[PDB]
Symmetry: none
Subunit: 149 residues, 4 copies
């Protein structure tokens, strides 16, 4: 039995590109924790994507994950683009490397370690908490660089 973990994820960068950040709520049994992060310049797509990756990368063994996200960007990668890209060597239709490849390869790598059940949202209470986390980090005058951006 892997541990059962619930992960909730958000990114926010409104003004896009511009400074932004990400938020994460992790639940195990009774325990809940939060991470967040801010960047001086990033996209909303990168934040939405970084948030599940930072939460996954933080785990200390393999686990069974229920992962809930609001991002149509992340959803479509998981369901369609990733398989597509991976079997095209992380090139798009123009031979160009995938925009945000740094991040997609981190997610794909991280996803393999875990039993992930992906939940896609439109309002879930850990997700709202995430949006608060992301907005605060984005608003705390971040200087940190998004290196892959």
């Amino acid at each position: 039995e892997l541990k059962l973990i619930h992960i909730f994820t958000d990114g926010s960068c409104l003004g896009n590109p511009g400074p932004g950040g990400y938020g994460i709520v992790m639940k195990y049994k009774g325990h809940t924790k939060e991470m967040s992060g801010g960047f001086s310049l990033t996209t909303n797509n990168r934040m939405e994507l970084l948030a599940p990756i930072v939460a996954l990368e933080a785990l200390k063994e393999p686990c069974k994950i229920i992962l809930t996200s609001d991002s149509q960007y992340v959803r479509q990668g998981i369901m369609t683009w990733i398989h597509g890209w991976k079997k095209n060597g992380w090139m798009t239709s123009n031979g160009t490397p995938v925009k945000n490849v740094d991040l997609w390869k981190r997610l794909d790598k991280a996803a393999q370690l875990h039993q992930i059940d992906w939940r896609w949202v439109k309002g879930h209470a850990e997700n709202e908490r995430c949006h608060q986390l992301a907005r605060a980090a984005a608003e705390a005058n971040p200087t940190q660089i998004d290196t892959g951006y």
Copy 2:
């Protein structure tokens, strides 16, 4: 072996009362934030949980520089802990040390790392204070199983 600066803080709205902690980690040009909220807790437990969460998060052995303005924790890793461990983590006719659940975890986690503590009387600490207060205000439901 990575060099990480960790900053920590705790906050409690009435003491006792709802609370949270706030943690910043810088490593080269990477910054990440952590926080957490509890429905009923204390100023002291939160000041202590901050560094504990920050240190149990680490995935490998490292050099840490750890800054915190919580005299409670200073006195714990300066003076109290060795004496407490020597007596098997209990007062001197049987009563367990106060917040022992936490000091055990902090002791256990500090061992796994290499740590220079800075004690500061209280920038990244502001951020930590921003994190802890927010987590305290966001109506947390979580229980501090230690009281």
Copy 3:
């Protein structure tokens, strides 16, 4: 004086045909419950149809129901099928029997008892309670059930 209940249903079956299950969420005001069941050999369609049959049969009085399902099969028989089929007394034109007539007769009989607003949804993603029903249905299906889907 009628209770307002929100029911949410799914059905699933490892391969197709295969061991299967159904999963149900019933909300009424602040209250939530959950139902499921497992079958040794069945199909996607049977499990999808049986779900709501079992939710409605579980009611003790007549009720106002908003009932959400992603099943196209059940949707097709709600709105056309079950109607076409009762005109012909439950047979095809060749008087060969209607497929899954046992479930179909059960759902029609139960429907009449309640006043029911159906909602059709694309998939369980993301409709939180449908996601729950899908998880209930799979874990009943994955539990090596022994009960038979009386045919089927």
Copy 4:
């Protein structure tokens, strides 16, 4: 004199904590399943709530063989319920009984049916107790948002 087999469990995940109850109901060839989750509850409320919801779902009087592993439940049925009924539903020092809401519903439901109660040491095995226990865990593990009023 409809004759039914009913197995119950509850589970909790740290206590108090998210919780759920699991029920398996058997009748001739027909197996049914029931579960329910709450965001904060106890191990005892969940062991007790499980036979309650299972009896409350019955439509008519029944012979029930009811199998559970709750000593919490057993001690109530055997001992405590009789006690408290004759004391106006207070403790020996009369204050209100912890989980009185639940104990009254089980008392009410008990009385409609003829129940043979079977006590077991754990879920292992019959299968059906094992099934309950997976249903209770999985209801607790589903991030339930419902409130146990209750607790």
